[PDB]
Design a protein around this ligand. Structure first.
Ligand SMILES: C=CCN(Cc1ccccc1C(=O)NCc1ccc(OC)cc1)Cc1ccc2c(c1C(=O)O)OCO2
Ligand SMILES: C=CCN(Cc1ccccc1C(=O)NCc1ccc(OC)cc1)Cc1ccc2c(c1C(=O)O)OCO2
Lengths: 149, 149
């Protein structure tokens, strides 16, 4: 549970937003890329796993599950690469709701920057700091500190 | 002290590596950019502060301390922007030693990727996971969790 993350790919403005969600907390990291390739996804996972103790990633589609570059990054970074089959049907819903919330936030900040990447990092910040009372950023730290102890 | 970070700029292969270090733990985030500008530094701090509870940043030089774009991102993200004067002379040495360790790690992985940005993210991963016993990634989570509690 503390080490499990889910990849999610959404689209805006003709670009791709790649998201990793820490499933137990709802905390996210995200980036804009011009298209989802195995190299971009592999690089994104390398970044994530240098920052948080990523044990397992549920990939966002079969092409990223198949990609030998993504499998190579997961090998390098010590991550168990898994499929993203929603054996719990509530998973599809949680991810659709997250993309809709993120896109809502991006539209709320969109005029505050020229480049979509800037708006998406403002949206990561607001999402992670939003009190629901704890924020997603507080929950991930507590979950992982509990695991370390 | 759980919220205090230090910016650091180092050079390799004709490029710039921008580093944020969490002072109490030694944990780092880093990125490669073609040159250190106010916009690149402001974007980097926006990313950092959406991922960790960044209260204070000691900027790496007077150009980033002065930059109105850097000041605007620190306003947006709720960061107190401070200068980086090493009132403790041990601060100079610690940053120099970190740059030398990071460049050593980059040389140890350099032939495992074409692009320097890849090598630098491998080096962030190795640095954050190295036990010296706890790793910097463990120390930062424990420090912030203690603080939330
Ligand atoms: C001279 C700055 C260029 N713009 C000006 C702009 C252009 C259009 C609308 C608003 C603005 C505006 O000032 N908003 C406030 C602001 C300030 C700093 C800030 O720092 C994170 C983010 C936002 C902001 C910007 C900075 C760094 C970036 C960007 C962009 C971008 O516009 O996307 O892209 C990647 O790094
Ligand atoms: C598949 C083509 C790309 N190369 C091949 C390569 C070129 C030269 C030397 C070694 C290799 C090699 O296979 N090493 C192992 C490896 C695999 C996956 C991995 O994923 C993080 C990092 C490393 C690795 C790469 C992937 C993603 C990127 C990169 C680069 C890069 O070379 O820098 O740049 C930004 O995203």
């Amino acid at each position: 549970s503390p080490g499990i993350w889910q990849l999610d790919c959404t689209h805006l403005e003709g670009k791709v937003i790649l998201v990793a969600v820490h499933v137990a907390s709802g905390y996210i990291e995200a980036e804009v890329i011009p298209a989802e390739t195995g190299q971009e996804t592999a690089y994104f996972l390398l970044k994530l796993a240098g920052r948080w103790p990523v044990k397992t990633v549920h990939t966002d589609n079969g092409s990223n599950f198949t990609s030998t570059t993504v499998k190579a990054a997961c090998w390098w970074a010590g991550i168990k690469q898994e499929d993203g089959i929603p054996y719990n049907p509530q998973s599809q819903g949680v991810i659709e709701s997250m993309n809709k919330e993120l896109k809502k936030i991006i539209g709320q900040v969109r005029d505050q920057a020229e480049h979509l990447k800037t708006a998406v990092q403002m949206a990561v910040f607001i999402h992670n700091h939003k009190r629901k009372g704890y924020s997603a950023g507080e929950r991930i730290v507590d979950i992982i500190a509990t695991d370390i102890q």
